[PDB]
Amino acid sequence: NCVQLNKLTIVPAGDSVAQLLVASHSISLIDIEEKKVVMTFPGHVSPVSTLQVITNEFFISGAEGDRFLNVYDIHSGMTKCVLVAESDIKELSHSGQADSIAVTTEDGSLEIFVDPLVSGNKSKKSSKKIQIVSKDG
Amino acid sequence: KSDFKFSNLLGTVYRQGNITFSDDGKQLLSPVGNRVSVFDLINNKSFTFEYEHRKNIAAIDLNKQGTLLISIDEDGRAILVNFKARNVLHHFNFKEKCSAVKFSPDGRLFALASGRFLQIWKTPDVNKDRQFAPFVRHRVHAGHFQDITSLTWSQDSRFILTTSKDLSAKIWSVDSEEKNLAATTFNGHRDYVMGAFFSHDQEKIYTVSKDGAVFVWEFTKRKYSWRITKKHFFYANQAKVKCVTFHPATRLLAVGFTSGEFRLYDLPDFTLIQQLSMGQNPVNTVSVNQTGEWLAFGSSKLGQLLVYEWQSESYILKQQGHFDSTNSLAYSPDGSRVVTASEDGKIKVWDITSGFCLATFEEHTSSVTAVQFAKRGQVMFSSSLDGTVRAWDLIRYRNFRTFTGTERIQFNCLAVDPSGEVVCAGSLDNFDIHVWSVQTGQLLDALSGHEGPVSCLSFSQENSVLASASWDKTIRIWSIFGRSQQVEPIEVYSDVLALSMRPDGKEVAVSTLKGQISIFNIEDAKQVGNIDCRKDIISGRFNQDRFTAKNSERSKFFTTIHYSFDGMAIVAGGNNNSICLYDVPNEVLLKRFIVSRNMALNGTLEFLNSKKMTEAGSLDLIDDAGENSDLEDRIDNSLPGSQRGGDLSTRKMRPEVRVTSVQFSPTANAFAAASTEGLLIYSTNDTILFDPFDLDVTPHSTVEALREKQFLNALVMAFRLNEEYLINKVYEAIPIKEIPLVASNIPAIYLPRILKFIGDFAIESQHIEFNLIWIKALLSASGGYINEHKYLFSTAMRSIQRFIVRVAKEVVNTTTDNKYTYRFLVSTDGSM
Amino acid sequence: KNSKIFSPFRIIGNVSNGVPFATGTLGSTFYIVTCVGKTFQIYDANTLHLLFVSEKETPSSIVALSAHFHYVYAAYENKVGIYKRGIEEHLLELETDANVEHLCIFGDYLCASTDDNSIFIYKKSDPQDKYPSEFYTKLTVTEIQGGEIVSLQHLATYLNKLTVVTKSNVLLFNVRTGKLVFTSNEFPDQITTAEPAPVLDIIALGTVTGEVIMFNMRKGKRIRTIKIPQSRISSLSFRTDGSSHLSVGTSSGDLIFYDLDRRSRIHVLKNIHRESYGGVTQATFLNGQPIIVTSGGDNSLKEYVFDPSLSQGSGDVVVQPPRYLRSRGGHSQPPSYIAFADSQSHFMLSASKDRSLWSFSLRKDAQSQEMSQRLHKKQDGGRVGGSTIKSKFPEIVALAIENARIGEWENIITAHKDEKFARTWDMRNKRVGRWTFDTTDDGFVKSVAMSQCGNFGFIGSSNGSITIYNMQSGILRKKYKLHKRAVTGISLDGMNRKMVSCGLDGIVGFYDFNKSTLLGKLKLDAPITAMVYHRSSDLFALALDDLSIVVIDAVTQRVVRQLWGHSNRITAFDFSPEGRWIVSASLDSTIRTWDLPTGGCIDGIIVDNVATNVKFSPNGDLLATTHVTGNGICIWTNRAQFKTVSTRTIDESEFIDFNTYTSLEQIDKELLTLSIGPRSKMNTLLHSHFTKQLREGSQSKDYSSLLATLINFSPAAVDLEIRSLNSFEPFDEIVWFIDALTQGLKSNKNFELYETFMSLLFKAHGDVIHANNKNQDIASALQNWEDVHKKEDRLDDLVKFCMGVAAFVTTA
Known part of the structure; x- marks a missing residue:
């Protein structure tokens, strides 16, 4: 019941590297030992681009060509919150302990996201936008 | 203001197919050309369903309880209709031509007479949701040799017998384990067995054939089975049966003969009650109730319906419409009146809700062409090709004075001043605008200046100057007052017809031969702006057309134009399938309307199906009238090139889809157009679609829905019970957060009941705010239903505004009194 | 869930999925039974008209399909359906928890295999009976056998x-024994x-190598072999027509003859079939037909046929190659964007990542036809720009269609993937028309709508420019510049007077269309992802990044309603036919339904799949969802047009005798x-242990004890009760009793x-407070009186409103 799978990240559970995250528009945390899909969160409509685990509870799912990051709660099985870039999310990196997230945008933009799991508040806009532009313009 | 939906079709009271009453004798089901009309006899109202069929209807029934309506075409299109809800549930296609659908008296399963096949299907469930394939064929009985023409159940569901044009009349059961109980056939007649029946006791069998014969079959001895105990012949000499019914609980035969005669009998006795000459024209369908005290005939030679009592010599309705001959249509200033003229001469007077010709005037001898109302809808006139304009009033319903010319000349169109002296008529022959006084029958003025016919005329509602349309492509505006007798031409460049003025009378809509409607100034001479119709008109290609509709010049103009009651919209209609709603100042059409979607109507289809285009000829243009079983239907009287002539059969063609007359209602912006099919009504009276709620109940069911949080449905289950303890339970049970959510979703059926419950209970109640939110939410919810029917809520609303002023506004006046004393005593000062 | x-009706637009379909005969003629997930379909072979569908969606996906004469045997997870006419007549639930792999019918038996390498045997209850219902036995295949x-x-x-065949070998059983x-x-x-x-x-076997083996059992020998270089075989069939x-x-995907x-x-x-989707999944000669x-x-x-052989003298040597016959197709990929094409709910456009349109017909499943992508020969004369290896048009993100002037010119505009223009199509000709419509500011088309x-046709760039092209000659009319971000949804009003646009800047711009002036400019909070307009009622809705749909009035030039309530990116959303409702679906696997006069989520469907579109x-009957998996279009019956349902705000909690x-x-x-009791007490009154209890309520600063006997005090005794209030300097019992009244209005009962x-x-005592006006002790308690008092103008706002509406509604 995963016929298309193009993104993968394994969890930092310790020495136990079981229950990793596979995704293509739909994500499954799946055990290595019991060979079963354990948790199934709906991903995005597009094929997924970025699949990053931040913390022990939260991981970012990213869509290709879409402007919406989704921060999913691991054990709760729901979205903790959403981030939304100014344009299509082209690349993703995150800090050590869910402090601030770097979004490389497809238009050419850098959106930073500051305390993404802080306290409606569920729609999280871009905090800072770091563009780069030449001397002449 | 834009959204107009189909409300009701009027007239053309029978074309083809079976007629039936409901469970109650109120509801009568008749086919129209492709639709089903329902006429409620005691509660005198009429109705026609929102949908149409694709060909002419040849089979019809409704449910036992009145829940499902089956209409079946000539071809075998079957349409499942929520009869109580007026919405279509399923389009099934039976691939054979069927003649009889009859539900069970159980209501559990219906059956169908298609070919030599009987098909017995389970009923689909109404309270269940609509499925892809709801229909389940229970059984199929094919023991017959020719086409099965008639069919009945027993009064028990467990016995069904059908009869064919083959000699046989055969009984079976629903269930095969009840096969061995009775499964046999009847024979021994002479001819088409046209109706075979069970008696009310399930022991006597009546079998009636085309030749004029009945056998009384009975399971009797010389094991032993099923002899004829007697025969019965009415001895119709050359006349033969067309249609036959049998009401069993009073043992009554209704017969329909080819000579238009009809007989009644008492079947263990076979005694002639009475013979009625229904006319020259044969009874094409008979019908009885379960009470069996009304009879229903339809002559498809004329197109008439007739409900008449057998016991008392008394009709209920003798309705006789005229196809292709709906020439004029007229809204009164009152929105309760409608006038239809004809080529036969009959000018009928309709109510919009209760669709009945309340009046008629059968005093014109020829075609009546144009009808306008004047002076608050009192007087109503009728110009004709009968050579006259005959006046009519709506109180005495009489002719006032037949205004005549000199040389007895036909009159094309009619225009009436609101100041009720001036009536102008334009002629198709004489092309001189004759002005008649209403008080004096002399002509006031013979306005001359039309080279070729005067098409159409209208006065302003404001300056009452008239605008006539030549066929010399030229408007002539006449200002006949102030003792000038002055004229002005407006040159158009192409051939105008169907003139129509704004109510302001400073702008005019014109339809040229190009289809282009132009708007003309009247205070000035130039053209204001022109809206195009040759692009956005649905036209049809006939089966005998030899050119495609994209470059057909058949119907891409407009035979009637009307301004809206702001003057800001226009509905136009022509010889096409398309009715159009242009905005006046924005100059672009809002919505395009089909009048009718019928294959037997000629110019309906845009693209013809190439499987019917054979080697030489159409597949339908072959004369198929020569294969009828009946001599009269095999007789061809069609004169070759008759276009919109006298009768239907004499075109030697299909009827063209054409719409003659177009008008707006003043009030609710509803527009009615008299089509080829008849008068159609579009309106903005939305949610008059009747909607039954929560159809099968305990008090526990509503209270469990309170526990189930199904609070609007619990209010319905309470209001079907009508015990005020339950209404005060369910009333104070819902929270405030879904009060206007509930009240907007309340039907109009319990609307006087809920308004009276609020209007009575809130007078003695401490929950003044809570009751007030209900009246706020209801009056903001469905105040429009109280806008139309004011006398329906007049007892409830009286109690409501008793509670508002004496009970609530007294508390409010106490509040504002203490408030204003506070404002005074804290805003002012003291002394010493 | x-x-x-709404309720599910069928998934429109599906023909098969890849599960090996079965063939059957009625008399002389043929039917075909294919699978679509949890729902199977039946076809005539001579026209590929749809004959039956399943009466129920199966609870799990169908794994196997066999078909005898009137009885089609489906096989999902543990249970096997015996279907007559697509209706569940007998479910045969196997006595394992193993999944049903394969199935066969012969004799008085049924035989179906599971993935525990064990086959189950199901006898008929009699040879007189027709479908097999008696459970006979279970036999197995151990790993020494196969x-x-x-x-x-x-x-x-x-x-x-x-005859049970494995990846290894072939076994034969006496299933009576x-x-x-x-x-x-x-x-x-x-x-x-x-x-x-x-x-x-002979049993023919096609292996994982390109090898087909004809195998005997009376010999037990592999009589002939057939090679294929480097292809994995999927299906085998025999033409029983008259030449072997x-x-x-x-x-x-390849078929070898x-x-x-x-x-x-x-x-x-x-x-003939796509390699990535399984190649050729199942091909079968109709028995005794070419x-x-x-x-x-x-x-x-x-369908394919052999033409009869051209060689009169030979016949069998000279063979016409197989030739295309009729076919029912669907979207190979799931559909990206759908719309309702016509007014009478006959046709639906569905575009996928298969890079094609399809014009499905919800009336008849065979009028569903794939649209052409064949360019008209260019009206200029100089030749067009594209690869000579003509690829399909890139997948579509937006759709736009008005049937006002259909077939006199183009009326379908489609915004393809990463193209600076957007092509036009005739709906009537089922073919892409002559004009393509650019952005003319070198950005992508990200939303389109037509007049x-x-x-x-209105075309909104990723850089903000909205071009108005004409459907007459493909000419532009005006190029509006309001947004500097991307446009993301355009519309026109129904009169073609005032046009709106929503952008990725957070702007909804109000322009006139006859006139050329920017009328209004509403600034919303998040950038605005989409725009849906209701022509009949002149509203327009929008999804934004604030997870919430704002419905904006175009007349009053402001928000009328905002539905908060979703949890994720709102994918698609739609008005009702009449503007009473909006159906929304988001990435939260919810499809919520909204009553916009109030603004509450009156139901939300939880789905297993995310609903994309x-x-x-336009008729009040049908709702179309497309999911992210699945290629068809789920059609939903709208029960409101049939009876009704309840309208409650019940979503967040999930997401008598007498x-x-x-x-x-x-x-x-x-x-x-x-x-x-009596309401007349106001009319009466308007036309000591007491003061001790008032003190003992004052020392609490809660006077709920006083109000009880205050209601119950006889009305003439109050004319001495208030006329003895003991206040000359301290004004205590004045302020005690006044704060008693203001605490009385706090619980709102007995408000009058x-x-x-x-x-x-x-x-x-109006003089006793009035001659000592400005005194901050009683003035504080009367300020408290006004603060408690100022809410209850909401019944004066109710009484006056409801009264005027009652009069206005009775008179007019």
């Missing part, structure tokens, strides 16, 4: 002998496909109530009575 407003069960077939003239009557030796290759033969004793011909279907007498291939069909029905995993089902007069029909009833005193504390007591204070 259940919806109240491998994983690839198929069960019954070769003819084999009395109760069951249960005894293995023969085991074949292993074939050294991995056997992948079985097929019986119109010759005796063999069908080899790869999983590479052999004549075993000439020992030669006849023609190999290439790419017609082979092929089925792919690309939602497609084709209701059929003369204008929702589309309310026939009498005493009244509730106070429903919620916020509402105001009166005194139980504390006003009557206030006016009775004015009858008693």
Whole structure:
């Protein structure tokens, strides 16, 4: 019941590297030992681009060509919150302990996201936008 | 203001197919050309369903309880209709031509007479949701040799017998384990067995054939089975049966003969009650109730319906419409009146809700062409090709004075001043605008200046100057007052017809031969702006057309134009399938309307199906009238090139889809157009679609829905019970957060009941705010239903505004009194 | 998960999925039974008209399909359906928890294999009976006997002998007994496909190598072999028409045709089905006819024929290659964007990542036709820009269609992937029309809509420019510049007067269309992802990044409603036919339904799949969802047009005997109530242990004890009760009793009575407070009186409103 799978990240559970995250528009945390899909969160409509685990509870799912990051709660099985870039999310990196997230945008933009799991508040806009532009313009 | 939906079709009271009453004798089901009309006899109202069929209807029934309506075409299109809800549930296609659908008296399963096949299907469930394939064929009985023409159940569901044009009349059961109980056939007649029946006791069998014969079959001895105990012949000499019914609980035969005669009998006795000459024209369908005290005939030679009592010599309705001959249509200033003229001469007077010709005037001898109302809808006139304009009033319903010319000349169109002296008529022959006084029958003025016919005329509602349309492509505006007798031409460049003025009378809509409607100034001479119709008109290609509709010049103009009651919209209609709603100042059409979607109507289809285009000829243009079983239907009287002539059969063609007359209602912006099919009504009276709620109940069911949080449905289950303890339970049970959510979703059926419950209970109640939110939410919810029917809520609303002023506004006046004393005593000062 | 407003009707737009379909005969003629997930379909073969569908969605996906004459046997997870006419007549639930792999029908038996390498046997209850219902036994295949069960077939003239083939070898059983009557030796290759033969004793096997083996059982010998270079075989079939011909279907999409007498291939069909979706999934010659029905995993089902042979003298040598016959196709990929095409709910446009349109017909499943992508010969004369290897148009993100002037010019505008323009199509000609419509500021088309007069197509760039092209000559009219971000949804009003646009800047711009002026500019908070307009009622809705749909009035030039309530990116959303509702679906796997006059989510459907596109029909009947998996279009019946349902705000919580009833005193504390009993007490009053209890309520600063006997005090005694108030300097009992009244209005019950007591204070001590006006002790308590008092103008706002509406509604 995963016929298309193009993104993968394994969890930092310790020495136990079981229950990793596979995704293509739909994500499954799946055990290595019991060979079963354990948790199934709906991903995005597009094929997924970025699949990053931040913390022990939260991981970012990213869509290709879409402007919406989704921060999913691991054990709760729901979205903790959403981030939304100014344009299509082209690349993703995150800090050590869910402090601030770097979004490389497809238009050419850098959106930073500051305390993404802080306290409606569920729609999280871009905090800072770091563009780069030449001397002449 | 834009959204107009189909409300009701009027007239053309029978074309083809079976007629039936409901469970109650109120509801009568008749086919129209492709639709089903329902006429409620005691509660005198009429109705026609929102949908149409694709060909002419040849089979019809409704449910036992009145829940499902089956209409079946000539071809075998079957349409499942929520009869109580007026919405279509399923389009099934039976691939054979069927003649009889009859539900069970159980209501559990219906059956169908298609070919030599009987098909017995389970009923689909109404309270269940609509499925892809709801229909389940229970059984199929094919023991017959020719086409099965008639069919009945027993009064028990467990016995069904059908009869064919083959000699046989055969009984079976629903269930095969009840096969061995009775499964046999009847024979021994002479001819088409046209109706075979069970008696009310399930022991006597009546079998009636085309030749004029009945056998009384009975399971009797010389094991032993099923002899004829007697025969019965009415001895119709050359006349033969067309249609036959049998009401069993009073043992009554209704017969329909080819000579238009009809007989009644008492079947263990076979005694002639009475013979009625229904006319020259044969009874094409008979019908009885379960009470069996009304009879229903339809002559498809004329197109008439007739409900008449057998016991008392008394009709209920003798309705006789005229196809292709709906020439004029007229809204009164009152929105309760409608006038239809004809080529036969009959000018009928309709109510919009209760669709009945309340009046008629059968005093014109020829075609009546144009009808306008004047002076608050009192007087109503009728110009004709009968050579006259005959006046009519709506109180005495009489002719006032037949205004005549000199040389007895036909009159094309009619225009009436609101100041009720001036009536102008334009002629198709004489092309001189004759002005008649209403008080004096002399002509006031013979306005001359039309080279070729005067098409159409209208006065302003404001300056009452008239605008006539030549066929010399030229408007002539006449200002006949102030003792000038002055004229002005407006040159158009192409051939105008169907003139129509704004109510302001400073702008005019014109339809040229190009289809282009132009708007003309009247205070000035130039053209204001022109809206195009040759692009956005649905036209049809006939089966005998030899050119495609994209470059057909058949119907891409407009035979009637009307301004809206702001003057800001226009509905136009022509010889096409398309009715159009242009905005006046924005100059672009809002919505395009089909009048009718019928294959037997000629110019309906845009693209013809190439499987019917054979080697030489159409597949339908072959004369198929020569294969009828009946001599009269095999007789061809069609004169070759008759276009919109006298009768239907004499075109030697299909009827063209054409719409003659177009008008707006003043009030609710509803527009009615008299089509080829008849008068159609579009309106903005939305949610008059009747909607039954929560159809099968305990008090526990509503209270469990309170526990189930199904609070609007619990209010319905309470209001079907009508015990005020339950209404005060369910009333104070819902929270405030879904009060206007509930009240907007309340039907109009319990609307006087809920308004009276609020209007009575809130007078003695401490929950003044809570009751007030209900009246706020209801009056903001469905105040429009109280806008139309004011006398329906007049007892409830009286109690409501008793509670508002004496009970609530007294508390409010106490509040504002203490408030204003506070404002005074804290805003002012003291002394010493 | 259940919806109240809508319900599933069918998934429109599916032909097959790849599960090996079955063939059956009625008399002389043929039907075809294919699978679509949890729902199977039946076809005539001579027209590919749809005959039946499943009466129910199965709870899990169908794994196997067999078909005898009137009875089609479906096989999902543990249970096997015996269906007559697509209706569940008998469910046969197998006595394992193993999943049903394969199935076969012969004799009085049914035989179905599971993935525990064990086959179950189901006898008829009698040979007089027609469908098998008696459970006979379970036999198994242990790993000395065979491998994983690839198929069960019954070769003819084999009395109760069951032929179970594995990846390894072939077994034969007496299923009356249960005894293995023969085991074949292993074939050294991995056997992948079985097929019986119109010759005796022969089973054809296509392995994981390109090898087909004809195998006897009376010999037990592999009589002939057939090679294929480097292709994995999927299906085998035999043309039983009159020349011995063999069908080899790869999983590479290719169909290979052999004549075993000439020992030669006849023609190999290439790419009749998509390789990535399973290749050729199942191809089968119709028995005794020169017609082979092929089925792919690309939602497609084709027919091919051998033409009769041109060689009069030879016949069998000269063979016409197979030739395309009728086919029902679907979207191979799931559909990206759908819309309702016509006004009468007949046609739906569906575009996918398969890079094609499809014009489905919800009336009849066979009028569903794929649109053409064939360019008109360019009206300029200089030749067009594209690869000569003509690829399909890139997948579509937006759709736009008005049927006002259909077939006189183009009326379908489609915003393809990453193209600076957007092509136009005739809906009537089922073909892309002559004009393509650019952005003219070198950005991508990200949203389009057309004019209701059929003369204008509106095209919104990623850099903000909105071009108005004409559908007459492909000419532009005006190029509006308002947004500097991307446009993301455009519309025109129904009169073609005032046009709106929503952008990725957070701007909704109000322009006139006849005129050329920017009328209004509403600034919303998040950037605005989409725009849906309701022409009949002149509203327009928008999804934004604030997870919430704002419905904006175009007349009053402001928000009328905002529905907060979703949890994720709102994918698609749609008005009702009449503007009463909006159906929304988001990435939260919710499809919520909204009553916009109030603004509450009156039902939300929880789905297993994420709903990508929702589309309310222009008729009041149908709702179309497309999911992220699944290629069809789920059609939903709208029950509101049939009876009704409840409308509650019940979503976030998931996501009698005596026939009498005493009244509730106070429903919620916020509402105001009166005194139980007579209402006439106000008319009376307006026309010591007491002061001790008032003190003992004052020392609490809660006076709830006083109000009880204050209601219950006789009305003439109050004319001395307030006329003895003991206040000359301290004004305590004045302020004690006034704060008693203001605490009385706090619980809102007996609301009128504390006003009557206030006016009775004015009858008693208005001078005692008035000559000592400005005194900050009583002025504080009367300020407290006003603060408690100022809420209850909401019934004066109710009484005056409701009164005027009542008069205005009765008179007019």
